[PDB]
Structure 1
């Protein structure tokens, strides 16, 4: 198809991350544009299924999603994307710039993810792996949803982010995505800490089933934690939409916490 490109048009430069798929490099494309490239290693993952990520990226275009640019479908295999200068949200949150983030910038970042996910929502897709590690940060604190490896049109998984019904019964929906967004809201409010501190996977599964939910993070306003609790409702279906989350987050400091004053950490 028309996404395909020749190898030579590219050039890889700096290396960025490593996984059991391959590598991630920064680079330039047609020697004029700054790009990012997700390599494969000598056929370590199934070739047809590896490009099933980009297959999905092809049909999604939104300002708050990492934009596909090009593909080299002929071995050695690649996937080329827009470049996100500030790396992953998880690294950002716990790194050196992370400590000066306050509630208004963190709420603004949540708003953007929600805006990106609301688009997924109206496109009838499911992300399946929504979390801080899967969001990229650009310049001006812009945040975009990434790592569509598992995204599906609506037709193991780290239970700490994954809704109960999806971890147990493989029932992934946009509403399981909502659940992960609730956990993503805790990573934002704690500068990037792992949820369910000191709890191990099976401890998390057993406790969540019995209705345990993480408490208000320190200095997080109750109204933001209430939103978290809504996202973690037992019935997938009583959970709010992204569209609602987007709108509630964008308007937060006027409609919900107009009395917010900056604290020690948030």
Structure 2
């Protein structure tokens, strides 16, 4: 029972409200040391802590920061608190109506920033999507849920690169594919991708070259980025470093003549 410095005593934690239901446990919102507001992911035990394992190694402003870990049962995992909730609920909720392409591309740029770090650290997320991005104050966005994240050595198919879904080949490039899918959730205010298609149909279609078309009002340049992310060859997909820089400069280098519309 040799715990590390991340370990803490349950007595220093006290969940106040609940934040959501979960497959492997819940997620509460409480107080740490009675002074710092935190989020807690409650509830194999050692397997459940693998997200903390990787979260201990990752440190970046665009990744939800791990604070402490309770290695006993009920096994907890304290992290930074994001006041706005998931991007998915954010996009479809009361807030979604006012977000325009400029704010949406900035949020994408931030996510691309967190993933570029994950890229440099030679890790893989494996479950990148809006439900796993958290929003905070000032439209700050951060990557979260590293339950499946690992050091590169059925998953939600609609967000998963075909080679990862079929052959188990999860690389940073399969996260890029997911990124492209995440871009459509941003540009459509969080609609589930591949409308009307069911998993089996999506898998077959994609394999046959099918790709989602340009969302209404989204510039062709942005949709082309999405298409580079969905290239059949994992290697011809852009890096996150590229995605971060392209998105950050988007309104000056790519769409300088951009004009706001009714939805984007």
Q: What interval of TM-score do these two structures reach, taking the shorter chain for normalisation? A: over 0.9
Tell which deviates more after alignment, 16-25 or 176-185. 16-25
1:158-182, Cα deviation, whole Å (9 max, x unpaired): 1100000000000000000000000
- Residue 10 (structure 1) shift: 1.1
- Take 1:213 and 1:135, find their aligned partners in 2: how far apart are those partners? 23
How far residue 22 of structure 1 moved from its aligned partner, in angstroms, is 1.4
Which digits, 9 at most, give the CA deviation of each residue in 1:18-50, with x for residues without a partner?
11211110011010001000001xxxxx01100
Q: 2:111 aligns with which of 97, 110, 113?
A: 113
1:99 is paired with a residue of what secondary structure? coil
Q: 1:9 aligns with which of 3, 9, 12?
A: 12
Q: CA deviation at 1:105?
A: 0.2
For residues 119 and 72 of structure 2, the distance between their equivalents in structure 1, rounded to whole angstroms, comes to: 32
Q: More deviation in 178-187 or 20-29?
A: 20-29
Q: Following the alignment from structure 1 to structure 2, what is the Cα–Cα distance between the partners of residues 4 and 254?
A: 47
How far apart, in 2, do the equivalents of 1:75 and 1:98 lie?
39
Cα offset for 1:74? 1.3
Structure 2 Cα separation of the partners of residues 125 and 20 of structure 1: 24
TM-score (norm 2): 0.98
Structure 1 residue matching 2:16: 3-state secondary structure: strand
Question: How many pairs does the alignment contain?
Answer: 261
Give distance in 2, aligned partners of 1:29 and 1:243: 35
* Separation of aligned partners in 2, 1:215 and 1:76: 46
Which stretch has the larger CA shift, 20-29 or 207-216? 20-29
Q: Deviations over 1:136-189 (max 9, x none)?
A: 000000000000000010001111000000000000000000000000000000
1:200-230: CA deviations, max 9, x gaps? 0010001000101000000000000000000
Q: Structure 1: which 4+ aligned runs deviate by more than 4 Å?
A: none
Q: Distance between the aligned counterparts of 2:154 and 2:163, measured in 1? A: 14
Q: Deviations over 1:6-25 (max 9, x none)?
A: 01111100101111211110
Q: Which runs of 5+ in 1 are unaligned?
A: 41-45
Q: Take 1:24 and 1:124, find their aligned partners in 2: how far apart are those partners?
A: 28
Deviations 1:242-262 (A, max 9, x none): 000000000000000000000
For residues 73-123 of structure 1, the C-alpha deviation after alignment (integer angstroms, 9 at most, x for no partner) is: 011210000000000000000000111000000000000000000000000
- Distance in 2, Cα, partners of 1:128 & 1:158: 10
CA distance in structure 2 between the partners assigned to 1:214 and 1:90 by the alignment? 19
For residues 246 and 206 of structure 2, the distance between their equivalents in structure 1, rounded to whole angstroms, comes to 26
Of 231, 256, 259 in structure 2, the residue corresponding to residue 261 of structure 1 is 259
Structure 2 runs not aligned, ≥5 long: none
